[PDB]
Design a protein around this ligand. Structure first.
Ligand SMILES: *[B]([O])([O])[C]([C]N1[C]=C(C2=[C][C]=[C]C(C([O])=O)=[C]2)N=N1)[N]C(=O)[C]C1=[C][C]=[C]S1
Length: 356
């Protein structure tokens, strides 16, 4: 019964606040089109402001799901193609070597040579433009997955160029409204700053995300629990949404390659359902997240799929998971990072106990 969802989240999520000294947490569940919101603790320790439905959290790498979506929207408005190259859109890179990698390989982290972060050195628009002009290849393109902010960041910049709008306006004026999101931002306006949580570092000091190269497309979206539940809703039921955005969403669900049990989609990670706990943990292992791994063609096309994505900034943790054919999903938002494995497991227990 409905009356168990609250209890299961208290048993599995609530203990984490004490175990990691997390000030504030928002956990959302959606099941059979009914939304449940559970709020714990404080958005701001110093203000004694409680987490609530208005609280804005940093999504970290969960922002990549929005970037992927924006990319799917542009592929279906004819504005780009995933076999295309950066040159067609960033006039300044037309024939250089990074005008050899495709928009898909960028989005899915399999260029020869891109790490997790730009070098600290790189910051201005001209330092990014020049980091990619004097970019030179390395690995057999397409063969190796290495998870990367620059790669999908560059995908994002290009998606934005094709729609003739800077990336931030593509999300706030086009993508967010089409998803019906009311309080999701690349830049949080002044009128909403009172709702923007403090994040907290491992020294429990209050912090928020710092400006960085191509931050908006790689990790720069902020949102509320209601909005993320609406995003999960749309992923679970894109039939009700405008046809452009429906097509964008389905585009982000298509698996592109395997790295072992993990299928890489656009933004999302995909698994065969039901998946074992360990399968889901492996997607966030040092092996998968930090090191290169060789990518194989999809062999088993799972009949029933599930999808997840973890995300962090220095001050915030996020996890989102959904299973289309159970018509369920879960969103966890914290204003202190906790281990990825702890996010994945609590969600696992909750969604299996409800799978009834
Ligand atoms: B995304 O969440 O996958 C992506 C990569 N990233 C960085 C971290 C992390 C883990 C421990 C500590 C820190 C810290 O204090 O900075 C970060 N987890 N996943 N996120 C980002 O690149 C966003 C950031 C930009 C600057 C710092 S994190």
């Amino acid at each position: 019964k409905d009356q168990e969802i609250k209890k299961l989240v208290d048993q599995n999520f609530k203990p984490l606040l004490e175990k990691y000294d997390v000030p504030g947490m928002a956990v959302g569940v959606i099941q059979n089109n009914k939304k449940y919101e559970m709020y714990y603790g404080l958005q701001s320790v110093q203000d004694k402001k409680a987490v609530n439905s208005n609280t804005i959290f940093e999504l970290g790498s969960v922002s990549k799901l929005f970037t992927a979506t924006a990319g799917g929207y542009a592929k279906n408005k004819g504005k780009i193609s995933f076999d295309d190259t950066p040159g067609k859109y960033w006039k300044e890179l037309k024939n250089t070597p990074i005008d050899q990698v495709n928009l898909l390989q960028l989005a899915t982290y399999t260029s020869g040579n891109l790490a997790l972060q730009f070098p600290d050195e790189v910051q201005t628009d001209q330092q990014v433009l020049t980091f990619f002009k004097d970019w030179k290849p390395k690995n057999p393109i397409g063969e190796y997955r290495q998870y990367s902010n620059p790669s999908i960041g560059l995908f994002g910049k290009v998606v934005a160029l094709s729609m003739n709008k800077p990336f931030d306006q593509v999300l706030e004026k086009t993508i967010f409204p089409a998803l019906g999101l009311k309080h999701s931002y690349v830049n949080v306006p002044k009128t909403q700053m009172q709702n923007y949580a403090f994040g907290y570092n491992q020294e429990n000091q209050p912090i928020r995300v710092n400006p960085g190269p191509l931050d908006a497309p790689a990790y720069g979206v902020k949102s509320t629990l209601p909005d993320m539940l609406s995003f999960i809703h749309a992923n679970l039921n894109p039939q009700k949404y405008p046809t452009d955005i429906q097509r964008a969403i389905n585009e982000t669900h298509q698996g592109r390659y395997q790295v072992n049990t993990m299928y890489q989609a656009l933004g999302w990670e995909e698994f065969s359902y039901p998946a074992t706990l360990q399968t889901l943990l492996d997607s966030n292992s040092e092996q998968i997240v930090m090191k290169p791994n060789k990518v194989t063609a999809i062999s088993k096309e799972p009949s029933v799929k599930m999808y997840h994505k973890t995300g962090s900034t220095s001050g915030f943790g996020t996890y989102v998971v959904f299973i289309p054919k159970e018509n369920i999903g879960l969103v966890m938002l914290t204003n202190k990072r906790i281990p990825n494995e702890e996010r994945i497991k609590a969600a696992y227990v909750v969604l299996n106990a409800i799978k009834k």
